[PDB]
Amino acid sequence: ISADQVNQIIYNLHHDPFEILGCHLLEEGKNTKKWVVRAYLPKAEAAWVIRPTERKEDPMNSVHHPNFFECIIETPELNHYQLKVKEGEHEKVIYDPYAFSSPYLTDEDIYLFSEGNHHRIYEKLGAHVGEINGVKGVYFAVWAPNARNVSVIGDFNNWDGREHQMRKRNYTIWELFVPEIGSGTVYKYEIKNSEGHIYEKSDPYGFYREVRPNTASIVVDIDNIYQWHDEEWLEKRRNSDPLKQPVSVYEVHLGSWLHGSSAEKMPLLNGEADPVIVSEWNPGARFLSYYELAEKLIPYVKDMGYTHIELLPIAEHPFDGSWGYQVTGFYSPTSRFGRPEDFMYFVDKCHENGIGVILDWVPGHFPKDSHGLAYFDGTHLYEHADPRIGEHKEWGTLVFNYGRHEVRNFLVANVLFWFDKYHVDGIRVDAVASMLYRNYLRKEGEWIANEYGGDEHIEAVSFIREVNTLLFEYFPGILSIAEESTEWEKVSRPVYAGGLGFNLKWDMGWMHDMLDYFNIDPYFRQYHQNNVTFSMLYYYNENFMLALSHDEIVHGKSNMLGKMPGDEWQKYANVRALFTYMYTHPGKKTMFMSMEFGQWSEWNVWGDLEWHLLQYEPHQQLKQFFTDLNALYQQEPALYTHDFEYHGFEWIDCNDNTHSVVSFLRRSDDPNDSLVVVCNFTPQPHSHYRIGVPEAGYYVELFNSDAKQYGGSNMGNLGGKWADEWSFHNKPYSLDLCLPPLAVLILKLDPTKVP
């Protein structure tokens, strides 16, 4: 480029910067093309073009001005890239602001979508504020290849679409530009199918929606509603390996954590709205907004010391009682809690407080509601036509046709969407088996095998692998978590290694072993020592997340306290021993709201949590216990640096089944960070119990779950114990400990102590 052109950009004299900024074809070779990407990056000293899907990164060079950059790249197609931008000591990674010079679908957009590879399709499908022919308005576009006609109906035309009939492009996508409307416009698509039947659909790519049970889509000016402040968070995330960090998740259902009064408006970020009543049977209660949740949940979690919040599905869903697992508005956060910018505020505030956000994401099915994706254009469009693979009859829902390009694209781009537009730090997928198996919950003679005669759902495996490949290329540093309940192999291993590409898997076997164990009367736990120890036998086959989830405290299973045998004191003690063991056992941690304060009743999605319990000392003390335990977890490297390496764990002794005692080491990079963990899973205290340790010296009693401030009996080692030179458990030194009842100790060598 010329200095004249550069200067015109620098000084805002250029008539259209899209002519020179962004990606432009310079020439075509025999088997490749030569492209330039240009960027004007005021205050940046350096920049690079990342091609994450090719695993390439090319420096940009300043050209004529220190803040004007160019990068020449040869490759057959330059569809997917990001800019890395360095300003002083800080780097950010963004999409190119000059990527898309028009709001309408280009030939190239249509080609990539038709192949399944348009990773940013949601910039053009749906409803977008823009300008065509010189006039500002909204561009609508919708995939409905078999429809006879489609019209846009909404507030602007009194729900009569005759003068807003769309135009069909390339036999597949309908479009329309409507002048002089903007964000806030309420609309649907009116479709006529090949039989001539006329019906109404919400926008599959809609960014916002009326409050259930209303279903109109609402236009959002999604890039001009919120100013983020989380660049430093995002930079640390991208440059870190979350597998080597503390990850302690507080699982939350946003509709049911805390409710407000329906006698007042719902406050929003700089605004308000009408209250959303929780149910017709509890009409004095309303949901809190994303904004109020940012003001209340976030400092709560921060104070408790969790590293992450995991949300039950916040995608738009018509029925509260599905908990969010039956989604019909995949591209919009639910309007129960306010607007898209209110949820952006929530995430930005989590990041400001050093808390990550993991979203339960639901690609496995969708319900039949007529506003939603079902039978979209008068054919089986999103769902497979064959009910043997396209319906989950036991659930009454429909299964996406994962092999169909535009359906695959809807979902792949959907996952990306939440990381792009809402800056989230991870996803979790529930019931991954539901996708992986062609015979899932199907009787003999009611499913068919794959092309090789197996039960593997080939198209769904390919889709999962593509999601996880892309996610980690575009957003390194994220968490992709699976619950898979059939022992499918290599769930949490890279795709190149034959895995599904998740980085964590819930240890459901561990969860069952633990809860089943602790439910047993302590005298009988001697017959079930194997529940304590078995999960370490397969542990190194996956990267495990130790999750005690919402699913375990509903449907007659009781809340945690109620699972435990004995009198009130011992129920509390069992809870503290179990969770101390969980936090010291190898693997990342997840627990669900209400577990941290000892709610007695089961989780009820229709009400809120029993916060009044926190007026009473025993619930206060258990909440303090969790607060201290999360703090300890973040402060002790041996609890998180080597979760997934042999080095990080070794049993000291696990044979004393008749006393339900086990002990083990955790380690990290510094030998002086090693920890000695001792568990006593009966109420019998032990005044002298010998445990082998690896070094001489004084072992501080770093944590003790029977401490009085946690509700315990305050038994223990009064600070710590000097090791004896007395061989034990095949170790040269040993501690003569007092073991409190129904409790776990963590001890740590203080190599500087005075003898």
Annotated binding site: 608
Asked if 643 touches Mg ion (CB under 5 A), the answer is no
Smallest distance, Å, CB 164 to Mg ion? 11
> Do the Cβ atoms of 345 and 291 come closer than 8 Å?
yes
Long-range contact pairs involving 66-69 (C-beta distance under 8 Å, separation at least 24):
67/10, 67/40, 67/41, 67/42, 67/43, 68/6, 68/9, 68/10, 68/38, 68/39, 68/40, 68/41, 69/38, 69/39, 69/40, 69/41, 69/44
Could you tell me how many residues of this chain bind Mg ion (CB under 5 A)? 4
Give 270's contacts (C-beta < 8 A, 6+ positions apart). none
Looking at the Cβ atoms of 10 and 654, the one nearer to Mg ion is 654
Q: Which stretch binds Mg ion (CB under 5 A): 206-214, 234-242, 402-410, 603-611?
A: 603-611
For 27, left (φ over 0), alpha (ψ -120 to 50), or beta?
Answer: beta
Distances (CA, A) of 446 to 148, 374, 400, 459: 34, 22, 18, 19
Question: DSSP letter at 645?
Answer: S
> Do the Cβ atoms of 413 and 126 come closer than 8 Å?
no
Looking at the Cβ atoms of 315 and 609, the one nearer to Mg ion is 609
Asked if 608 touches Mg ion (CB under 5 A), the answer is yes
> Do the Cβ atoms of 216 and 210 come closer than 8 Å?
yes
Rounded to a whole number of angstroms, the CA Rg of the chain reads 28
Beta bridge partners of 184: none
User: Which residue ranges are tagged as binding site for Mg(2+)?
Assistant: 608
> Do the Cβ atoms of 741 and 731 come closer than 8 Å?
no
Alpha-carbon distance 40 to 1, whole Å? 13
Question: DSSP letter at 328?
Answer: S
Which class for 595: exposed (0-12), middle (13-18), buried (19 or more C-beta within 10 A)? buried
Smallest distance, Å, CB 68 to Mg ion? 53
Q: Which x/- pattern, by CB under 5 A, does the window 428-457 give for Mg ion?
A: ---x--------------------------
Looking at the Cβ atoms of 562 and 607, the one nearer to Mg ion is 607
Looking at the Cβ atoms of 71 and 482, the one nearer to Mg ion is 482
Give the residue numbers marked as catalytic: 430, 483
Distances (CA, A) of 629 to 356, 544, 636, 745: 19, 20, 11, 12
Q: Which stretch binds Mg ion (CB under 5 A): 304-312, 405-413, 426-434, 592-600?
A: 426-434
Looking at the Cβ atoms of 492 and 599, the one nearer to Mg ion is 599
DSSP 512-551: HHHHHHHHS-GGGGGGGHHHHHGGGGTGGGS-EEEEE-GG
Looking at the Cβ atoms of 153 and 622, the one nearer to Mg ion is 153
> Do the Cβ atoms of 628 and 292 come closer than 8 Å?
no
Alpha-carbon distance 382 to 365, whole Å? 10
Looking at the Cβ atoms of 320 and 425, the one nearer to Mg ion is 320
Q: Which stretch binds Mg ion (CB under 5 A): 179-187, 604-612, 634-642, 708-716?
A: 604-612
The residue among 577, 584, 579 whose CA lies nearest residue 676 is 584
Give 554's contacts (C-beta < 8 A, 6+ positions apart). 602, 603
Beta bridge partners of 58: 49
Smallest distance, Å, CB 688 to Mg ion? 31
Smallest distance, Å, CB 3 to Mg ion? 58
Smallest distance, Å, CB 579 to Mg ion? 22
Judged by CB under 5 A, the chain residues 362 through 401 that form the site for Mg ion are none
Q: How far is CA 176 from the centre of its chain?
A: 34
Looking at the Cβ atoms of 99 and 654, the one nearer to Mg ion is 654
Smallest distance, Å, CB 161 to Mg ion? 6
Q: Which stretch binds Mg ion (CB under 5 A): 181-189, 230-238, 533-541, 606-614?
A: 606-614
Smallest distance, Å, CB 487 to Mg ion? 15
Q: Which stretch binds Mg ion (CB under 5 A): 20-28, 441-449, 599-607, 659-667?
A: 599-607
Smallest distance, Å, CB 162 to Mg ion? 7
Interstrand relation of 479-482 and 504-506 (parallel, antiparallel or unpaired): parallel
Q: Which stretch binds Mg ion (CB under 5 A): 67-75, 364-372, 374-382, 424-432?
A: 424-432
Alpha-carbon distance 290 to 506, whole Å? 27
Beta bridge partners of 250: 309, 591
Looking at the Cβ atoms of 160 and 645, the one nearer to Mg ion is 160
Q: Which stretch binds Mg ion (CB under 5 A): 61-69, 594-602, 608-616, 636-644?
A: 608-616
Alpha-carbon distance 10 to 67, whole Å? 9
Alpha-carbon distance 74 to 86, whole Å? 24
Looking at the Cβ atoms of 431 and 632, the one nearer to Mg ion is 431
Give 748's contacts (C-beta < 8 A, 6+ positions apart). 636, 673, 674, 675, 676, 699, 700, 702
Smallest distance, Å, CB 160 to Mg ion? 5
Asked if 513 touches Mg ion (CB under 5 A), the answer is no
Smallest distance, Å, CB 728 to Mg ion? 29
Judged by CB under 5 A, the chain residues 148 through 167 that form the site for Mg ion are 160
Q: Name the residue with the smallest CB distance to Mg ion.
A: 608
Helix residue spans in 309-429 (DSSP H): 340-352, 387-390, 405-421
Q: Which amino acid is at 599?
A: Q
Q: Which residues of the chain form contacts with Mg ion (CB under 5 A)?
A: 160, 431, 607-608
